Structure formats: C-alpha cells, structure tokens
Amino acid sequence: PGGDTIFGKIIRKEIPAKIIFEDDQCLAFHDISPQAPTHFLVIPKKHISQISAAEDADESLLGHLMIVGKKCAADLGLKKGYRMVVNEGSDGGQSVYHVHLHVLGGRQMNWPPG
Amino acid sequence: PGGDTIFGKIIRKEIPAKIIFEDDQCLAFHDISPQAPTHFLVIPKKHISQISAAEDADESLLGHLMIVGKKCAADLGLKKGYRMVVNEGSDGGQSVYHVHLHVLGGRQMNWPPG
Ligand SMILES: Nc1ncnc2c1ncn2[C@@H]1O[C@H](CO)[C@@H](O)[C@H]1O
Ligand SMILES: Nc1ncnc2c1ncn2[C@@H]1O[C@H](CO)[C@@H](O)[C@H]1O
C-alpha cells in the first residue's frame, strides 16, 4: 500500500514528514524544498504513478486532493491566495512517480508558471 | 448558466474560443495568451468562482477537469508531459473568477512554477 517511491515510504510512515492533514484517501505535508513561504503537497494514499495514468474512476479522488489543498491553505492562513500545480512527466518536471499536488502561497506567484 | 465572466460568455458561445473538447460538464479551449507551445484551459460549465469556493460535492467535477486535461494533452501530442495549474486569488495570479485549469506543455517547464 502506497507504492515503491519516496511518497510510498511517507504514506507507510517509514519516514516522517511534516503532516498537516490525513484522512482515509490522502495525506498533506510540507515540501522539503519549499519554493514559497508556504509550499505543501497533497498525495493520494492510492498509488497512481502520474496524472496521465489516472482513470475515470479516480476523478473524485483527484478532486479531493484540491479540496484538501484548499482546506490546508486556509488552515495555514493563505488569505491572499495560492497556486496549485501537478507535474506530469519529463516536461512537467515530475521526479517522483506518485501523483502529487503542490500548493504554493505566501508570496505573489509569477507568470509563466515555469 | 456559465456565470458573468469572460468564461461565461465562452460557455454560452456568445464568443467563440478555440474549443478542443466539450462534454456536459466542461469545456477545453486554447489559451489566447499561450505561455508554452501548447497551452489550453479546462473549465467547468458550472460557475464556481475560485477553487477556494468549491464545495465537497464538487470533487468529482474538479477531478473531471484533470482527466479531460490528460485526454486533451494526449490528443495534442504531449508525449513528454505537461504541467497543470490552478490559480487562486491575488497571490495565485487569478484574473478571471471562474475556475480554470491551465495545461501547459511542448517545452520543458521550469521550477519554481512562478
Ligand atoms: N521526504 C520528502 N518530504 C517532503 N517533500 C519531499 C520529500 N522528497 C521529495 N520531496 C518533494 O517532492 C516534490 C516532488 O515533486 C519536490 O517538490 C520535493 O522537494
Ligand atoms: N477569450 C479568451 N479565450 C481564451 N483564453 C482567454 C480569454 N480571455 C482570457 N483568457 C486566458 O484566460 C486565462 C485566465 O487565467 C489567461 O491565461 C488568459 O490569457
């Protein structure tokens, strides 16, 4: 359960993370290389390698990650907003093959988004 | 139906857009100010002003936007990957208050994501 990546280890608690939310579907934790004053990840407990591998039946789970991200952003005081990011594959900058939603805020986010 | 923003006008077809996908839940169309060789938006037909205003019952719809984004990215040949972005509020760089998912690819996306 949780798969064979860094994030599988986090889900199994084999290594800790700075956990800010947990429910039966997902986990949220602070990013170890933050790119903004607040930068956290929301990950499903189900191992989905990448967004391009998600199936139709995963829609509710994927949307759950954004609703959790909204809740966590509010808990962390992101009153002025935030940016949500999912990276796919090489061009997207994905390095860990377990779906993860980035939530960044606490500063003005620029454009383009990379 | 569709709300009182630019994107409401697009949903009602009062102004055209470069539509690449339509179903009963959402619309996808090319962005008018592209930041990558492929840059399109996926929007719900339901007016949700911003991700921070989405409700729990919207989870399936939000996840549908990413699954549509995955499908469109494949139709557009984004074999090397892509980045998905949702902007919230001022700090997120949101300018149109109707939820929209950006999908960018056809080049290496950089880090940080703005
Ligand atoms: N042990 C870890 N805890 C928290 N974030 C991590 C860990 N390993 C990698 N990351 C974050 O995972 C992301 C992968 O997209 C990165 O932003 C990276 O910094
Ligand atoms: N008529 C339009 N058709 C397509 N994209 C648009 C239109 N108006 C604004 N946008 C795009 O909407 C986004 C709002 O985040 C921008 O990336 C902007 O370029």
Swiss-Prot record, chains A, B:
Gene3D superfamilies xrefs: HIT-like
Positions annotated to bind AMP: 31-32, 87, 93-95, 100-102
Protein name: Adenosine 5'-monophosphoramidase HINT1
InterPro entries to which the protein is assigned, alphabetical: Histidine_triad_CS, Histidine_triad_HIT, HIT-like, HIT-like_sf
Keywords: Acetylation, Apoptosis, Cytoplasm, Hydrolase, Nucleotide-binding, Nucleus, Phosphoprotein, Protease, Thiol protease, Transcription, Transcription regulation, Ubl conjugation pathway
Gene Ontology biological process terms from the UniProt entry: intrinsic apoptotic signaling pathway by p53 class mediator; protein desumoylation; proteolysis; purine ribonucleotide catabolic process; regulation of DNA-templated transcription
Enzyme class, first EC level, given as a word: hydrolase
Family label: Belongs to the HINT family.
Catalytic activity: adenosine 5'-phosphoramidate + H2O = AMP + NH4(+)
Domain of life: Eukaryota
Pfam family, one: HIT
Phosphoserine modifications at: 33, 60
Assembly information from the UniProt record: Homodimer. Interacts with CDK7. Interacts with RUVBL1 and RUVBL2 and is associated with the LEF1/TCF1-CTNNB1 complex and with a KAT5 histone acetyltransferase complex. Identified in a complex with MITF and CTNNB1. Interacts with CDC34 and RBX1, and is part of a SCF (SKP2-CUL1-F-box protein) E3 ubiquitin-protein ligase complex. Interacts with SUMO1, SUMO2 and RGS17. Interacts with the Ten-1 ICD form of TENM1. Interacts with CALM1; interaction increases in the presence of calcium ions.
Domain spans labelled HIT: 6-114
Effect on the protein upon substituting residue 95 to A: No effect on its ability to convert adenosine 5'-O-phosphorothioate into 5'-O-monophosphate
Expression sites (tissue/organ): Widely expressed.
A GO CC term assigned to this protein in UniProt: histone deacetylase complex
Chief subcellular location: cytoplasm
Residue positions of the active site: 100 (tele-amp-histidine intermediate)
EC number annotated for this UniProt entry: 3.9.1.-, 3.4.22.-
Modified residues (N6-acetyllysine): 9, 18
Compartments where located: Cytoplasm; Nucleus
Known function: Exhibits adenosine 5'-monophosphoramidase activity, hydrolyzing purine nucleotide phosphoramidates with a single phosphate group such as adenosine 5'monophosphoramidate (AMP-NH2) to yield AMP and NH2. Hydrolyzes adenosine 5'monophosphomorpholidate (AMP-morpholidate) and guanosine 5'monophosphomorpholidate (GMP-morpholidate). Hydrolyzes lysyl-AMP (AMP-N-epsilon-(N-alpha-acetyl lysine methyl ester)) generated by lysine tRNA ligase. Hydrolyzes Met-AMP, His-AMP, Asp-AMP, lysyl-GMP (GMP-N-epsilon-(N-alpha-acetyl lysine methyl ester)) and AMP-N-alanine methyl ester.
GO MF, one example: nucleotide binding
Motif interval(s): Histidine triad motif: 98-102
